Amino acid sequence: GREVSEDVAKQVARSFLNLKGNEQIHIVKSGKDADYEVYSLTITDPKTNQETYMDITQKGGYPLWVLEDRDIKKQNISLNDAMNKATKFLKDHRFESLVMAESAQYDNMGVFTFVEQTESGVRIYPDSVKMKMSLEDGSVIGFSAKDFLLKHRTRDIPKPKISKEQAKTKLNSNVKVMEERLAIITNDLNEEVLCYEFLGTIKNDTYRIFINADTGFEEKVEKLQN
């Protein structure tokens, strides 16, 4: 967890992005005015002149943020296949204990959000990792662990004041529940609140509904896509 030199930040990049070695890498260090100590990399393909931007923490050399500025011409794989590849990528690159929270297809890309899961399975939605995958080949083209790496902290999570059964009665009568877990989200005013999270369908549309674990009141209702 020490500092790393600009040569070390280079090798992190090669491994994370599966670079073979013909890529020139232009690296920049954050100034003294900077809020965060980060190495800004601009990796250039020689074959095409496609550019990739990657940020790594000056301390500990953590993959913080990635963007391959590339438009995807063809969809060869399903969104579901992309989902699996994203999950595998995270596990292969030391991002463990994440679970998928959001998925969408946009401009021949799969866009995914994963969130931290505690030891006992509580989903910490603020502690998130965002991924964008090419649907042409399943490659990673965007990545952000800024929320996960910086908002993360050891929390001591309180006990619910209402049971999961009581929480479930707080749902609307038309909801068909398929799954329930405990979760931490912000309320509308940016403070962390413990909730029962329900995944279900309301008239064929899929919804995630959060019920406050102390009051039983709604905290968030979200339509999911598919």
Coordinates of C-alpha atoms in Angstrom, one line a residue:
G1 CA 0.0 0.0 0.0
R2 CA 3.0 2.3 -0.5
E3 CA 3.5 4.8 -3.3
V4 CA 4.2 3.4 -6.8
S5 CA 6.4 4.9 -9.5
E6 CA 5.2 5.8 -13.0
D7 CA 6.8 2.6 -14.3
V8 CA 4.8 0.4 -11.8
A9 CA 1.5 2.2 -12.8
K10 CA 2.4 1.1 -16.4
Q11 CA 2.4 -2.6 -15.5
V12 CA -0.9 -2.4 -13.7
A13 CA -2.4 -1.0 -16.9
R14 CA -0.9 -3.8 -19.2
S15 CA -2.4 -6.5 -16.9
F16 CA -5.8 -4.9 -16.3
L17 CA -6.4 -4.0 -20.0
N18 CA -4.7 -7.1 -21.4
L19 CA -2.2 -5.1 -23.4
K20 CA 0.2 -7.2 -25.5
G21 CA 3.1 -4.7 -25.6
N22 CA 3.1 -2.6 -28.8
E23 CA 1.1 0.2 -27.1
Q24 CA 2.7 3.5 -26.3
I25 CA 1.6 4.8 -22.9
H26 CA 1.7 8.6 -22.2
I27 CA 1.5 9.0 -18.4
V28 CA 0.8 12.1 -16.4
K29 CA 1.0 12.8 -12.6
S30 CA -1.6 14.8 -10.6
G31 CA -0.4 18.3 -9.6
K32 CA 0.1 19.8 -6.1
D33 CA -3.3 21.4 -6.3
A34 CA -4.9 18.0 -7.0
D35 CA -7.4 16.6 -4.5
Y36 CA -6.3 13.0 -5.3
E37 CA -2.9 11.5 -6.1
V38 CA -3.5 9.8 -9.4
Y39 CA -1.6 8.8 -12.5
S40 CA -3.5 9.7 -15.7
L41 CA -2.5 7.4 -18.6
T42 CA -3.3 7.7 -22.3
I43 CA -2.6 4.4 -24.0
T44 CA -2.5 4.5 -27.8
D45 CA -2.9 1.6 -30.2
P46 CA -0.4 2.0 -33.1
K47 CA -2.5 -0.1 -35.5
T48 CA -5.5 2.1 -35.3
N49 CA -4.9 5.2 -33.3
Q50 CA -7.6 4.3 -30.7
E51 CA -6.9 5.9 -27.4
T52 CA -7.6 4.5 -23.9
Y53 CA -7.6 6.6 -20.7
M54 CA -6.8 5.0 -17.4
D55 CA -6.4 6.4 -13.9
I56 CA -4.5 4.6 -11.2
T57 CA -3.9 5.6 -7.6
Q58 CA -0.4 7.0 -6.9
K59 CA -0.8 5.1 -3.6
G60 CA -1.1 1.4 -3.9
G61 CA -1.6 1.3 -7.7
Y62 CA -5.3 0.6 -7.7
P63 CA -7.2 0.5 -11.0
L64 CA -9.5 3.5 -10.4
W65 CA -11.0 4.4 -13.8
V66 CA -10.8 3.4 -17.4
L67 CA -12.3 4.5 -20.7
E68 CA -11.5 3.1 -24.2
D69 CA -12.9 5.8 -26.5
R70 CA -14.2 3.4 -29.1
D71 CA -17.6 3.1 -30.9
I72 CA -18.9 -0.5 -31.3
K73 CA -20.1 -1.5 -34.8
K74 CA -21.7 -4.9 -34.3
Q75 CA -23.5 -6.9 -31.6
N76 CA -22.2 -10.5 -31.6
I77 CA -23.0 -11.5 -28.0
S78 CA -26.1 -11.2 -25.8
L79 CA -26.5 -8.8 -23.0
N80 CA -26.7 -11.9 -20.7
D81 CA -23.3 -13.1 -22.1
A82 CA -21.8 -9.7 -21.5
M83 CA -23.1 -9.8 -17.9
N84 CA -21.2 -13.0 -17.3
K85 CA -18.0 -11.7 -18.9
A86 CA -18.2 -8.6 -16.7
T87 CA -18.7 -10.8 -13.6
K88 CA -15.7 -13.0 -14.5
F89 CA -13.5 -10.0 -15.2
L90 CA -14.1 -8.5 -11.7
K91 CA -13.3 -11.8 -10.0
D92 CA -10.2 -12.3 -12.2
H93 CA -8.9 -8.8 -11.2
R94 CA -9.2 -8.9 -7.4
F95 CA -12.6 -7.3 -7.2
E96 CA -14.4 -9.8 -5.0
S97 CA -17.7 -9.7 -3.1
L98 CA -19.6 -7.7 -5.7
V99 CA -23.0 -8.5 -7.0
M100 CA -24.8 -7.1 -10.1
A101 CA -27.3 -4.3 -9.4
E102 CA -28.0 -2.8 -12.9
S103 CA -27.7 -3.8 -16.5
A104 CA -28.6 -2.1 -19.7
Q105 CA -27.8 -2.2 -23.4
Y106 CA -26.8 1.1 -25.0
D107 CA -25.2 1.7 -28.4
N108 CA -23.8 -1.9 -28.8
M109 CA -22.4 -1.8 -25.3
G110 CA -23.5 -3.6 -22.1
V111 CA -23.5 -1.2 -19.1
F112 CA -23.4 -2.7 -15.7
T113 CA -23.3 -1.6 -12.0
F114 CA -22.1 -4.0 -9.3
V115 CA -22.3 -3.3 -5.6
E116 CA -20.4 -4.5 -2.5
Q117 CA -21.9 -7.3 -0.5
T118 CA -20.9 -7.6 3.3
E119 CA -19.9 -10.8 5.0
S120 CA -23.5 -11.6 5.8
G121 CA -24.8 -10.6 2.4
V122 CA -26.0 -7.0 3.0
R123 CA -25.9 -5.1 -0.3
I124 CA -24.1 -1.7 0.0
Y125 CA -25.3 0.3 -2.9
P126 CA -23.1 3.3 -2.3
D127 CA -20.0 1.1 -2.7
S128 CA -20.3 0.5 -6.4
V129 CA -18.3 -0.5 -9.5
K130 CA -19.4 0.5 -13.0
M131 CA -18.5 -1.4 -16.1
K132 CA -19.1 -1.0 -19.9
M133 CA -18.5 -4.0 -22.2
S134 CA -18.2 -4.3 -26.0
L135 CA -21.0 -6.4 -27.3
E136 CA -18.8 -7.2 -30.4
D137 CA -16.2 -9.2 -28.5
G138 CA -17.0 -9.0 -24.8
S139 CA -14.1 -6.8 -24.0
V140 CA -14.0 -4.2 -21.3
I141 CA -14.3 -0.6 -22.6
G142 CA -15.2 1.3 -19.5
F143 CA -14.6 0.8 -15.8
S144 CA -15.0 2.9 -12.6
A145 CA -14.3 1.8 -9.1
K146 CA -14.3 5.3 -7.7
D147 CA -17.4 4.8 -5.5
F148 CA -16.2 1.3 -4.3
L149 CA -12.6 2.3 -3.5
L150 CA -13.3 5.7 -1.9
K151 CA -16.8 5.6 -0.4
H152 CA -15.9 2.2 1.2
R153 CA -15.6 2.0 5.0
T154 CA -16.1 -0.5 7.7
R155 CA -19.6 0.0 8.9
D156 CA -21.4 -1.5 11.9
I157 CA -24.8 -2.2 10.4
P158 CA -27.8 -1.9 12.8
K159 CA -30.5 -4.5 13.5
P160 CA -33.8 -4.0 11.7
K161 CA -36.7 -2.8 13.9
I162 CA -39.2 -4.6 11.8
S163 CA -39.1 -8.2 10.4
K164 CA -38.8 -9.2 6.7
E165 CA -42.4 -10.5 6.9
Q166 CA -43.6 -7.1 8.3
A167 CA -41.6 -5.3 5.6
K168 CA -43.2 -7.4 2.9
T169 CA -46.7 -6.4 4.0
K170 CA -45.6 -2.8 3.3
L171 CA -45.4 -3.5 -0.4
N172 CA -48.2 -2.7 -2.8
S173 CA -50.7 -5.5 -3.3
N174 CA -49.9 -6.0 -6.9
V175 CA -46.2 -6.8 -6.4
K176 CA -45.1 -10.3 -7.1
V177 CA -41.9 -10.8 -5.0
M178 CA -39.1 -13.0 -6.4
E179 CA -36.3 -12.1 -4.1
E180 CA -35.6 -10.2 -0.8
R181 CA -32.3 -9.1 0.8
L182 CA -31.0 -6.5 3.3
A183 CA -29.4 -3.4 1.7
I184 CA -27.9 0.0 2.6
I185 CA -28.8 2.9 0.3
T186 CA -29.0 6.6 0.8
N187 CA -32.4 8.1 1.4
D188 CA -33.5 11.1 -0.7
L189 CA -31.2 13.3 1.4
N190 CA -27.9 11.4 1.0
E191 CA -27.8 9.6 4.4
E192 CA -27.2 5.8 4.7
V193 CA -30.3 3.9 5.7
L194 CA -30.9 0.1 6.2
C195 CA -33.6 -1.3 4.1
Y196 CA -35.2 -4.6 3.0
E197 CA -34.8 -4.8 -0.8
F198 CA -37.4 -6.6 -2.8
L199 CA -37.0 -7.7 -6.4
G200 CA -40.4 -8.4 -8.1
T201 CA -42.7 -7.8 -11.0
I202 CA -45.6 -5.3 -11.2
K203 CA -47.6 -6.3 -14.3
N204 CA -44.8 -7.8 -16.3
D205 CA -42.3 -5.0 -15.5
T206 CA -39.5 -5.7 -13.1
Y207 CA -39.0 -3.4 -10.1
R208 CA -36.6 -3.1 -7.2
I209 CA -38.3 -1.7 -4.1
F210 CA -36.6 -0.6 -0.9
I211 CA -38.5 -0.6 2.4
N212 CA -37.0 1.2 5.4
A213 CA -36.0 -1.6 8.0
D214 CA -37.0 0.7 10.9
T215 CA -40.2 2.4 9.8
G216 CA -41.5 0.2 7.0
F217 CA -41.9 3.2 4.7
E218 CA -40.7 3.2 1.1
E219 CA -37.2 4.7 0.4
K220 CA -36.8 4.0 -3.3
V221 CA -38.7 2.4 -6.1
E222 CA -36.9 1.6 -9.3
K223 CA -38.0 0.0 -12.7
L224 CA -35.4 -2.4 -14.1
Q225 CA -35.0 -3.1 -17.8
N226 CA -35.0 -6.3 -19.9

